[PDB]
Scaffold this active site. Structure first.
Site, mmCIF file in Angstrom:
data_model
loop_
_atom_site.group_PDB
_atom_site.id
_atom_site.type_symbol
_atom_site.label_atom_id
_atom_site.label_comp_id
_atom_site.label_asym_id
_atom_site.label_seq_id
_atom_site.Cartn_x
_atom_site.Cartn_y
_atom_site.Cartn_z
ATOM 1 N N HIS B 202 20.607 1.206 15.459
ATOM 2 C CA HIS B 202 21.447 2.281 15.886
ATOM 3 C C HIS B 202 22.651 1.690 16.819
ATOM 4 N N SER B 206 24.471 1.447 10.225
ATOM 5 C CA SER B 206 24.013 0.781 9.014
ATOM 6 C C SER B 206 25.151 0.286 8.226
ATOM 7 N N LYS B 228 18.206 12.645 0.399
ATOM 8 C CA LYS B 228 18.026 11.111 -0.340
ATOM 9 C C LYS B 228 16.553 10.384 -0.169
ATOM 10 N N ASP B 229 16.291 10.387 1.382
ATOM 11 C CA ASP B 229 14.957 9.803 1.880
ATOM 12 C C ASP B 229 13.774 10.679 1.175
ATOM 13 N N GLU B 272 -4.249 -11.848 -1.527
ATOM 14 C CA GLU B 272 -3.498 -10.454 -2.501
ATOM 15 C C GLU B 272 -2.173 -11.072 -2.776
HETATM 16 C C1 HEM Z 1 8.432 -2.357 8.931
HETATM 17 C C2 HEM Z 1 9.092 -1.395 9.066
HETATM 18 C C3 HEM Z 1 10.728 -1.002 8.977
HETATM 19 C C4 HEM Z 1 11.222 0.095 9.233
HETATM 20 C C5 HEM Z 1 10.610 1.475 10.050
HETATM 21 C C6 HEM Z 1 12.750 -0.140 9.131
HETATM 22 C C7 HEM Z 1 13.569 1.041 9.369
HETATM 23 C C8 HEM Z 1 15.093 0.474 9.061
HETATM 24 C C9 HEM Z 1 15.960 1.734 8.562
HETATM 25 C C10 HEM Z 1 15.499 3.293 8.594
HETATM 26 C C11 HEM Z 1 17.097 1.003 8.365
HETATM 27 C C12 HEM Z 1 18.338 1.892 7.856
HETATM 28 C C13 HEM Z 1 17.974 2.361 6.212
HETATM 29 C C14 HEM Z 1 17.507 1.163 5.671
HETATM 30 O O1 HEM Z 1 18.146 0.127 5.808
HETATM 31 O O2 HEM Z 1 16.952 1.457 4.506
HETATM 32 C C15 HEM Z 1 17.035 -0.291 8.386
HETATM 33 C C16 HEM Z 1 18.051 -1.038 8.316
HETATM 34 C C17 HEM Z 1 17.613 -2.495 8.412
HETATM 35 N N1 HEM Z 1 16.397 -3.270 8.271
HETATM 36 FE FE1 HEM Z 1 14.690 -2.378 8.487
HETATM 37 N N2 HEM Z 1 12.872 -1.375 8.614
HETATM 38 C C18 HEM Z 1 11.777 -1.964 8.481
HETATM 39 C C19 HEM Z 1 11.565 -3.277 7.995
HETATM 40 C C20 HEM Z 1 12.461 -4.205 7.886
HETATM 41 C C21 HEM Z 1 12.059 -5.513 8.082
HETATM 42 C C22 HEM Z 1 10.692 -6.235 8.140
HETATM 43 C C23 HEM Z 1 13.431 -6.423 8.022
HETATM 44 C C24 HEM Z 1 13.492 -7.938 8.170
HETATM 45 C C25 HEM Z 1 14.610 -8.571 7.816
HETATM 46 C C26 HEM Z 1 14.295 -5.341 8.088
HETATM 47 C C27 HEM Z 1 15.778 -5.531 7.932
HETATM 48 C C28 HEM Z 1 16.705 -4.734 7.910
HETATM 49 C C29 HEM Z 1 18.243 -4.747 7.942
HETATM 50 C C30 HEM Z 1 18.793 -6.252 7.717
HETATM 51 C C31 HEM Z 1 18.721 -3.647 8.272
HETATM 52 C C32 HEM Z 1 20.307 -3.095 8.001
HETATM 53 C C33 HEM Z 1 20.508 -2.728 6.677
HETATM 54 C C34 HEM Z 1 22.130 -2.337 6.635
HETATM 55 O O3 HEM Z 1 22.786 -2.352 7.617
HETATM 56 O O4 HEM Z 1 22.429 -1.905 5.602
HETATM 57 N N3 HEM Z 1 13.918 -3.741 7.907
HETATM 58 N N4 HEM Z 1 15.596 -0.465 9.057
HETATM 59 C C1 HEM Z 2 0.794 -2.220 8.710
HETATM 60 C C2 HEM Z 2 -0.293 -1.693 8.886
HETATM 61 C C3 HEM Z 2 -1.751 -2.232 8.254
HETATM 62 C C4 HEM Z 2 -1.547 -2.936 7.012
HETATM 63 C C5 HEM Z 2 -0.523 -3.599 6.452
HETATM 64 C C6 HEM Z 2 -3.053 -2.850 6.541
HETATM 65 C C7 HEM Z 2 -3.576 -3.849 5.754
HETATM 66 C C8 HEM Z 2 -5.028 -3.838 5.339
HETATM 67 C C9 HEM Z 2 -5.303 -4.371 4.044
HETATM 68 C C10 HEM Z 2 -4.476 -5.216 3.191
HETATM 69 C C11 HEM Z 2 -6.677 -4.186 3.959
HETATM 70 C C12 HEM Z 2 -7.789 -4.719 2.698
HETATM 71 C C13 HEM Z 2 -8.410 -3.438 2.117
HETATM 72 C C14 HEM Z 2 -8.734 -4.019 0.655
HETATM 73 O O1 HEM Z 2 -8.883 -5.196 0.588
HETATM 74 O O2 HEM Z 2 -9.063 -3.252 -0.159
HETATM 75 C C15 HEM Z 2 -7.040 -3.064 5.150
HETATM 76 C C16 HEM Z 2 -8.385 -2.807 5.415
HETATM 77 C C17 HEM Z 2 -8.705 -1.951 6.549
HETATM 78 N N1 HEM Z 2 -7.820 -1.778 7.596
HETATM 79 FE FE1 HEM Z 2 -5.938 -1.727 7.492
HETATM 80 N N2 HEM Z 2 -3.699 -2.354 7.642
HETATM 81 C C18 HEM Z 2 -2.918 -1.820 8.643
HETATM 82 C C19 HEM Z 2 -3.318 -0.816 9.553
HETATM 83 C C20 HEM Z 2 -4.670 -0.418 9.971
HETATM 84 C C21 HEM Z 2 -4.710 0.571 10.798
HETATM 85 C C22 HEM Z 2 -3.894 1.151 11.572
HETATM 86 C C23 HEM Z 2 -6.258 0.674 10.860
HETATM 87 C C24 HEM Z 2 -7.033 1.415 11.758
HETATM 88 C C25 HEM Z 2 -6.540 2.476 12.240
HETATM 89 C C26 HEM Z 2 -6.705 -0.283 10.023
HETATM 90 C C27 HEM Z 2 -8.028 -0.574 9.572
HETATM 91 C C28 HEM Z 2 -8.562 -0.999 8.312
HETATM 92 C C29 HEM Z 2 -9.830 -0.915 7.968
HETATM 93 C C30 HEM Z 2 -11.093 -0.280 8.737
HETATM 94 C C31 HEM Z 2 -10.218 -1.816 6.694
HETATM 95 C C32 HEM Z 2 -11.212 -1.982 5.954
HETATM 96 C C33 HEM Z 2 -11.887 -0.577 5.656
HETATM 97 C C34 HEM Z 2 -12.252 -0.611 4.061
HETATM 98 O O3 HEM Z 2 -11.388 -0.919 3.406
HETATM 99 O O4 HEM Z 2 -13.188 0.333 3.816
HETATM 100 N N3 HEM Z 2 -5.620 -0.822 9.393
HETATM 101 N N4 HEM Z 2 -5.990 -3.132 5.898
HETATM 102 C C1 LIG Z 3 -7.984 -14.883 0.611
HETATM 103 C C2 LIG Z 3 -6.759 -15.493 1.126
HETATM 104 C C3 LIG Z 3 -6.793 -17.133 0.824
HETATM 105 C C4 LIG Z 3 -5.938 -17.935 1.203
HETATM 106 C C5 LIG Z 3 -4.871 -17.459 2.197
HETATM 107 C C6 LIG Z 3 -4.968 -16.240 2.488
HETATM 108 C C7 LIG Z 3 -4.230 -15.206 3.448
HETATM 109 C C8 LIG Z 3 -3.029 -15.603 4.125
HETATM 110 C C9 LIG Z 3 -2.643 -15.051 5.490
HETATM 111 C C10 LIG Z 3 -1.596 -15.660 6.244
HETATM 112 C C11 LIG Z 3 -1.457 -15.088 7.734
HETATM 113 F F1 LIG Z 3 -1.360 -16.170 8.499
HETATM 114 F F2 LIG Z 3 -0.271 -14.279 7.747
HETATM 115 F F3 LIG Z 3 -2.604 -14.224 8.042
HETATM 116 C C12 LIG Z 3 -0.784 -16.254 5.891
HETATM 117 C C13 LIG Z 3 -0.774 -16.853 4.181
HETATM 118 C C14 LIG Z 3 -1.831 -16.563 3.586
HETATM 119 F F4 LIG Z 3 -2.128 -17.243 2.099
HETATM 120 N N1 LIG Z 3 -4.682 -14.186 3.700
HETATM 121 N N2 LIG Z 3 -5.697 -13.856 2.711
HETATM 122 C C15 LIG Z 3 -6.449 -12.798 2.764
HETATM 123 C C16 LIG Z 3 -5.313 -11.809 2.299
HETATM 124 N N3 LIG Z 3 -4.119 -11.838 1.378
HETATM 125 N N4 LIG Z 3 -3.632 -10.706 1.543
HETATM 126 N N5 LIG Z 3 -4.017 -9.835 2.395
HETATM 127 C C17 LIG Z 3 -3.556 -8.540 2.392
HETATM 128 N N6 LIG Z 3 -5.301 -10.554 3.091
HETATM 129 C C18 LIG Z 3 -6.143 -15.262 2.016
#
Ligand code: HEM
Ligand code: HEM
Ligand SMILES: Cc1cccc2c(-c3cc(C(F)(F)F)ccc3F)nn(Cc3nnn(C)n3)c12
Ligand code: HEC
Ligand code: HEM
Ligand code: HEM
Ligand SMILES: Cc1cccc2c(-c3cc(C(F)(F)F)ccc3F)nn(Cc3nnn(C)n3)c12
Ligand code: FES
Lengths: 88, 384, 72, 243, 38, 122, 181, 291, 48
Positions: B202, B206, B228-229, B272
């Site tokens: 902000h 953007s 659009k969102d 994964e």
């Molecule tokens: C993970 C949750 C994220 C949220 C909630 C979020 C939120 C936003 C939003 C709403 C925008 C403006 C609209 C858009 O760009 O689509 C933005 C812009 C941007 N985001 Fe994120 N974002 C996320 C992830 C990321 C990540 C992980 C990166 C790492 C590089 C990233 C890099 C950027 C950049 C470079 C911009 C500027 C884009 C532009 O100015 O055109 N975003 N972010």
């Molecule tokens: C960015 C946020 C998160 C990401 C990217 C994420 C990602 C994941 C992934 C990849 C798995 C593997 C599930 C599978 O292999 O089927 C998992 C399982 C799980 N996560 Fe998340 N997680 C997030 C946030 C959370 C939060 C907020 C909670 C609890 C409030 C949570 C609790 C769990 C639990 C309990 C499981 C296993 C339960 C089940 O599969 O029955 N995670 N999560």
């Molecule tokens: C099952 C398995 C094997 C080998 C590596 C991984 C990783 C993994 C984790 C990290 C971090 F340091 F970030 F943790 C970095 C690189 C990796 F390769 N993760 N896993 C389980 C898995 N894979 N994808 N998810 C959602 N969980 C593995």
């Protein structure tokens, strides 16, 4: 706060006096004026213009991947066994 | 003053969602951000509704997950929503980063934003992995083992830090409880980093596809970009429904439904899909310490991208060579991810080494060289 | 006779599967002859028909799978 | 290697495959009967309770009778007097063996894995199970060596599997009159195991249909509303008239 | 106030989808199959 | 990032030798034509990253007529990108109108900044 | 001022107040479809809060009935709350024979509070601040609520204390030496 | 511009902690706010370090707590820090509200602030109670039972809402797991309400004992009021150490160390001290709904 | 250990008792000498 974007009153844009803008209330305009022509002609135009930049890198990467996969498959088949022993 | 601008909370909501002056020329690629937010929200929601029925204990973890699937009303739905929403969160994040690279949203004014984003990305995977270790399937257990063993590579502190993270002499109940707590929390620290990212955005606003100042023609976020969102959100939710209902386990790995036991090693210990590109690097580098260093560098070099991009023009929409190099980089990244899931076969190991080499060479050579060459070409073309 | 055997043994005679079946027969007879000699037990590597068998099974499966369940 | 990865099973056109297709619960009941008659000897189904069968493959009375047939470990009178009780709908189906070594020694060291999740825990799921049950050739491919107490089945990773073919023709008397061929029994068992691994399958696909309908309506409406709101900007023109 | 239309849409879509799903899956449901195994 | 002075220096380094000019200039012209910015009504200078103090200073010193023409070109490009349509060859910016109007001001600002840095560094 | 661009082709053919009415129709349809979808999702999630199939199966669990000393109060664990199965002798039945239309927050009698005097079933949870009453401290001769000192009558009626109602009688049916919930 | 004012995040930190123009006449009673924040932080920290060793299951809950006390390194310290920090959080909040009432900080300009504060208070108790139910001691179990039963008093939805919150027909494993999840979460929603409270404060600033405009004489929060906050923080931590180390169980109730069983009712079902004033009201009103 | 008894003393007292050893998973139940990690047994296996 020399942010390169300001709020609505001053967005940081330079003076632009001599430009005029025109729009019709959407309550009076077509939503689908260009949809039919656009979705085909315009989409094809965009795709054609942007194609080469996707195709050439994709062709290169996929050719390398196909070569690698075919070589590995040959290794793990019987006729390649000896070479699998030679390379390893 | 309208109430939406006097009230502090409504003032903030206005500044961010109602009269936020977005460039008029932003295409749908700029709607991923909000999408990611939605993803996070839904994940958190699903996660909470999983925490109410999940048991952190190692002996009860997998059985509790199956209890959710089979006995809890809508438990299957929430479980699959969470699992597939992790993958969809990373799909949206990868498209997010791809847009940032293509349209050069990483350049000077938003470098700070870029940095925050990079951190978020790392944090996100260090939350995804944690979550994947909670179910304690075979793949969960062996991934935890592999990662924690890799952490042992640090010379001075690696010998004893691994038991410190485990809570024991190997992945056990303390490890799973620790991962449950840290995994419930770290997403909420990431919710703060998301707000920080939004403020860093902000401050300077953007970018836009054309890579020029948007101040000439700005439009309020609402209604245009709100709707659009909405379009992108409904598309995302429709594809999410496809995966969740009609094909949920395709993104996951079947072996994760086997109760984990340290005595049996699965034929292929693989993350994964969306960790594959990084794990591929971990497989390619011989040294364990070097392997982990390169794995984290594959992400952190995004921090060097703004300084290695010597281009005087924001974005690549008008840059032939830059677009070609970026697309080749994207396909190399996909190839690296694909190699991540394959066994260690000869052509695959050499190709993984070459893929990592080119992945880093992109940032440290191609972007500088290509950008400078394109600046020179622009000037020497228009000079006539 | 179950439908599966009928489908397998009638697809095996299609020209698509015929080369695979011929190759499988040749490989099995060749490996039997190779195992006949005294050194067969000492050879570090002994020929196997797993590859040709897999090819034939793939060819017959790709022909029967869309057909079997209509019978059942 | 081709053998180590195991032959990829083909994609059969299951009656339940397809977005809007539900399980053939007749096949589910047939598969449950086959499991109880045959697979119950080797494999347990610990995560399936009689309560789950009601409204799926057995009437409440039928499941009640089956549960009452078995004896379950009742909560011993807390004076330490152990006793057994008739089973209830809530009791989980017992396995042939109390613990692992009973199975392994009974099964020459190999452990028959719990089938309550096997469909979800194997590549190809139902296709894999159906092919494996019918994959055993009459004669193993020439040149391969089978260890003692092992059988060859290409769909198994490595080719060597401990289980010998069990679904021989005309094994069980189907109570619906359907022929009890090995292929038919394999199909029924695969469908039953897929249900066991995905009991929410019917409701999952129905909720998916509802979600797709609602979300597609919302998506079309949002497209219309966006093109609508953007007509003023899409149709916007400019003129620039300096001196 | 809004809840009225939302509930109307929910009920309408639910009844329509349920009827269509039952008709399309008729032979494969438990309700229609139980009689054969009686 | 790259200073406009550096790119101009490199371009003059090349152009001073026909051996390389005769090879690159056709390639540069084809690259600029294929760059696709002209069909949107933009000149090369319009693409330059404004968000830099040197670039902002250079823009502020731009004459009124050039500034207004640039504003109209940027607005037209935004409208075209928004409407996903391009100007025909008749309305497109011809190669000869890529006059590099903004380069002199950017170079003046860069020279001032470099003089400041050089003087205060002694 | 000047000549405007010709929008003839862009102009809609439809009435001035009609097109906005149609816009209202579709915007409201989008809003209410979104409301229906949100209702479905929120209902689905909150349904997880409700009793899972395990808890429903565990409830309505029969209790091992049989012979027991007359007047002794047995205890069970149906649906978590204690169940005070008492085989009150004929003396308790005779005592309950005394009708009470007054001095009772909820006039009742063994006619409805028990199917047979030989097997009396009554949940031990109290009325105000549900607690397990003492089986012999009741001022009226039955159970007593130690938390507030409330007295439960032999028929389960609340005699004294902060009791809001009478001792609830579970929905357990009776059979031949068995309890059929 | 100083870097603390140009950078957005340092700009916010400056606006709130460094250059925030606090009235010069604010006494130590105005330092409770930051104290409360610290308490929340410490609680969350302790809470997280308990979640790594606490088991939400009903049968493992109390045993896992005892595992924390007896087996986990410093587990006793973290457990007692959390338990006594709940009480200290409520002490600070009661003094906070008392100051607000005494010095009239609830009047017109900060009415908005007031309401957020009130919400926080309610939320906080609806986090404290839940936490107390996690240990599943006798008092924990019977308090959960009493509160959920009181929830049944609602006429139209009270008959079936109680099983909805329980996850069953009585306080059992679903109830404790549900409370653990919602209790881990609600403090993190409360961290958002704390930020909202801070912004509602910052819009109009903070009051002063004299009850007049502070604009005549304002001082930056740093260093003056930062160091006053450090004084109150060290005093709070010293008293908190007294309780945590030398007398931890005095604030708590002994019966909570008895494994909870629904069949046995303790002689006195009573909340921790700081819920007593409200529970008293609940005891006084005859009708449960009225209560 | 280190509180009221030397490690050897606690070791001896634990070895005096017999604890439920993890039965060979062939279901053969057996007892084992107590270790320092074993919890002190109660006089009664259960409540009644
Ligand atoms: C993970 C949750 C994220 C949220 C909630 C979020 C939120 C936003 C939003 C709403 C925008 C403006 C609209 C858009 O760009 O689509 C933005 C812009 C941007 N985001 Fe994120 N974002 C996320 C992830 C990321 C990540 C992980 C990166 C790492 C590089 C990233 C890099 C950027 C950049 C470079 C911009 C500027 C884009 C532009 O100015 O055109 N975003 N972010
Ligand atoms: C960015 C946020 C998160 C990401 C990217 C994420 C990602 C994941 C992934 C990849 C798995 C593997 C599930 C599978 O292999 O089927 C998992 C399982 C799980 N996560 Fe998340 N997680 C997030 C946030 C959370 C939060 C907020 C909670 C609890 C409030 C949570 C609790 C769990 C639990 C309990 C499981 C296993 C339960 C089940 O599969 O029955 N995670 N999560
Ligand atoms: C099952 C398995 C094997 C080998 C590596 C991984 C990783 C993994 C984790 C990290 C971090 F340091 F970030 F943790 C970095 C690189 C990796 F390769 N993760 N896993 C389980 C898995 N894979 N994808 N998810 C959602 N969980 C593995
Ligand atoms: C007697 C012995 C039986 C019988 C009658 C059945 N199963 Fe099997 N099975 C058995 C063992 C000891 C094993 C372990 C083999 C190993 O190598 O570990 C198996 C294996 C399976 C599997 C697992 C396949 C895999 O993991 O790749 C499945 C699935 C399976 N068996 C299915 C199955 C079915 C459908 C049966 C129906 C009657 C059945 N088994 C019976 C031992 C035995
Ligand atoms: C629970 C965590 C809380 C935090 C982090 C917090 C934060 C703060 C801070 C730092 C201040 C200014 C300095 C001070 O007053 O101590 C303040 C002011 C105030 N707070 Fe809170 N507070 C909390 C609790 C509450 C609650 C629950 C209320 C409910 C009424 C409340 C009511 C007020 C009022 C009325 C003021 C204005 C005081 C004045 O203007 O003099 N506080 N808050
Ligand atoms: C405002 C914030 C919080 C308050 C006021 C609060 C209050 C309480 C209280 C009063 C108890 C009773 C302890 C006892 O009776 O000895 C408790 C226990 C507990 N709380 Fe918190 N809590 C808060 C936040 C948290 C957080 C953030 C977590 C986890 C991240 C958490 C997890 C627990 C656990 C696990 C217990 C029981 C563990 C044990 O005592 O061994 N709470 N809480
Ligand atoms: C043990 C016990 C008995 C009776 C009441 C309570 C309460 C209680 C909870 C609420 C709220 F709705 F806010 F939850 C309101 C009023 C109350 F009296 N709570 N408890 C346990 C406890 N007491 N103090 N803590 C940190 N937990 C009780
Ligand atoms: S004991 Fe509290 S009212 Fe019965």
């Amino acid at each position: 706060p020399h942010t390169y974007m300001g709020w609505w009153g001053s967005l940081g844009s330079p003076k632009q006096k001599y430009i005029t803008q025109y729009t019709i209330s959407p309550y009076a305009a077509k939503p689908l004026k260009g949809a039919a022509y656009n979705a085909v002609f315009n989409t094809f135009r965009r795709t054609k213009n942007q194609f080469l930049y996707v195709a050439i890198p994709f062709v290169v990467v996929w050719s390398i991947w196909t070569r690698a996969r075919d070589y590995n498959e040959y290794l793990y088949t019987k006729e390649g066994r000896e070479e699998l022993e030679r390379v390893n | 003053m309208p109430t939406r601008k006097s009230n502090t909370y409504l003032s903030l909501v206005n500044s961010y969602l109602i009269d936020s002056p977005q460039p008029s020329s932003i295409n749908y690629w700029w709607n991923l951000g909000s999408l990611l937010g939605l993803c996070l929200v839904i994940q958190i929601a699903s996660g909470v509704f999983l925490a109410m029925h999940y048991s952190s204990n190692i002996e009860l973890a997998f059985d509790s997950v199956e209890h959710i699937m089979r006995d809890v009303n809508a438990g299957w739905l929430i479980r699959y929503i969470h699992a597939n929403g992790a993958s969809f969160f990373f799909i949206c994040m990868y498209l997010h980063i791809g847009k940032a690279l293509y349209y050069g949203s990483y350049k000077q004014p938003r470098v700070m934003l870029w940095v925050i984003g990079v951190v978020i990305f790392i944090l996100t995977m260090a939350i995804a992995f944690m979550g994947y270790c909670l179910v304690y399937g075979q793949m969960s257990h062996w991934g935890a083992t592999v990662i924690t063993n890799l952490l042992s590579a640090i010379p001075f502190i690696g010998n004893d830090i691994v038991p410190f993270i485990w809570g024991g002499f190997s992945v056990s109940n303390p490890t799973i409880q620790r991962f449950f707590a840290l995994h419930f929390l770290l997403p909420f620290i990431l919710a703060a980093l998301v707000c920080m990212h939004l403020m860093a955005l902000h401050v300077h606003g953007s970018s836009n596809p054309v890579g020029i100042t948007g101040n000439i023609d700005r439009l309020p976020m609402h209604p245009y970009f709100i709707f659009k969102d909405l379009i992108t959100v409904f598309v995302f939710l429709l594809i999410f429904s496809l995966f969740v209902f009609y094909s949920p386990n395709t993104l996951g790995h079947p072996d994760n439904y086997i109760p984990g036991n340290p005595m049996v090693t699965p034929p292929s210990i693989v993350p994964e899909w969306y960790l594959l590109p990084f794990y591929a690097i971990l497989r390619s580098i011989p040294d364990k310490l070097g392997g982990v260093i390169a794995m984290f560098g594959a992400i952190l070099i995004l921090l060097s991208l703004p300084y290695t991009d010597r281009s005087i023009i924001r974005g690549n929409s008008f840059k032939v060579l830059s677009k070609l190099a970026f697309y080749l980089f994207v396909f190399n990244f996909i190839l690296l991810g694909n190699l991540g899931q394959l066994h260690v076969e000869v052509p695959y190991i050499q190709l993984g080494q070459f893929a990592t080499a080119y992945y880093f060479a992109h940032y440290i050579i191609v972007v500088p060289v290509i950008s400078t060459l394109e600046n020179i070409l622009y000037y020497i073309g228009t000079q006539t | 006779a179950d439908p599966l055997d009928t489908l397998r043994e009638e697809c095996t005679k299609t020209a698509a599967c015929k080369p695979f079946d011929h190759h499988f027969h040749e490989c099995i007879e060749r490996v039997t002859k190779e195992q006949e000699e005294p050194d067969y037990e000492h050879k570090h590597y002994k020929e196997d028909c797993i590859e040709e068998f897999f090819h034939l099974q793939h060819c017959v499966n790709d022909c029967v799978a869309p057909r079997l369940f209509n019978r059942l | 290697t081709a053998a180590e990865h195991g032959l990829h099973p083909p994609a059969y056109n299951w009656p339940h495959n397809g977005m809007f297709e539900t399980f053939d619960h007749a096949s589910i009941r047939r598969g449950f009967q086959v499991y109880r008659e045959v697979c119950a000897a080797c494999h347990s189904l610990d995560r399936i309770a009689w309560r789950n069968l009601v409204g799926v493959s057995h009437t409440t009375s039928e499941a009640k009778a089956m549960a009452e047939e078995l004896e379950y470990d009742d909560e011993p009178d807390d004076e330490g007097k152990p006793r057994k009780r008739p089973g209830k709908l809530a009791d989980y189906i017992p396995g042939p063996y109390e613990n692992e070594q009973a199975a392994r020694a009974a099964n020459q060291g190999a452990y028959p894995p719990d089938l309550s999740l096997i469909v979800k825990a194997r590549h190809g799921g139902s296709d894999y199970i159906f092919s494996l049950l019918t994959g055993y050739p009459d004669e193993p491919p020439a040149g391969v060596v089978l260890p003692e107490g092992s059988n060859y089945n290409p769909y198994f990773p490595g080719g060597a599997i401990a289980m010998g073919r069990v679904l021989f023709d005309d094994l069980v008397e189907y109570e619906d009159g359907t022929p009890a061929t090995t292929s038919q029994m394999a199909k029924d068992v695969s469908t039953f195991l897929n249900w066991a691994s995905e009991p929410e399958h019917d409701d999952r696909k129905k909720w998916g249909l509802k979600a797709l309908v609602v979300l597609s309506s919302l998506y079309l409406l949002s497209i219309w509303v966006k093109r609508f709101k953007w007509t003023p900007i899409k149709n916007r023109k400019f003129r620039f008239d300096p001196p | 106030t809004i809840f009225g239309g939302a509930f109307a849409f929910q009920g309408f879509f639910d009844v329509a989808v349920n009827k269509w799903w039952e008709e399309h899956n008729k032979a494969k449901l438990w309700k229609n199959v139980k009689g054969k195994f009686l | 990032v790259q200073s406009m002075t550096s790119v101009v220096k490199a371009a003059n380094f090349i152009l001073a030798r026909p051996t390389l000019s005769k090879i690159i200039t056709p390639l540069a012209q084809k690259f600029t034509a294929y760059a696709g910015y002209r069909e949107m009504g933009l000149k090369f200078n319009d693409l330059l990253l404004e968000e830099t103090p040197i670039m902002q200073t250079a823009i502020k010193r731009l004459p009124s007529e050039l500034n207004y023409s640039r504003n109209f070109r940027i607005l037209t490009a935004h409208q075209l990108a928004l409407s996903h349509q391009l100007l025909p060859a008749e309305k497109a910016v011809k190669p000869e109108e890529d006059d590099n109007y903004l380069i002199p001001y950017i170079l003046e600002a860069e020279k001032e900044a470099f003089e400041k840095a050089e003087l205060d560094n002694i | 001022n000047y000549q405007q661009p010709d929008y003839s082709s862009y102009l809609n053919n439809k009435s001035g107040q009609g097109s906005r009415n149609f816009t209202y129709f579709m915007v409201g349809s989008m809003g209410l479809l979104s409301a229906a979808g949100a209702k479905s999702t929120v209902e689905a999630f909150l349904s997880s809060f409700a009793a899972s199939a395990d808890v429903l199966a565990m409830a309505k669990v029969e209790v091992k009935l049989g012979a027991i000393p007359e007047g002794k109060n047995v205890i069970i664990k149906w649906q978590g709350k204690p169940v005070f199965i008492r085989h009150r002798t004929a003396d308790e039945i005779e005592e309950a024979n005394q009708v009470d239309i007054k001095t009772l927050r909820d006039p009742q009698n063994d006619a409805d509070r028990v199917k047979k005097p030989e097997w009396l079933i009554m949940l031990g949870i109290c009325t105000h601040l549900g607690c397990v009453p003492i089986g012999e401290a009741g001022d009226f001769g039955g159970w007593f609520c130690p938390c507030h000192g409330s007295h439960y009558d032999i028929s389960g009626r609340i005699r004294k204390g902060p009791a809001p109602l009478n001792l609830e009688i579970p929905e357990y049916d009776f059979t031949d030496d068995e309890t059929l919930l």
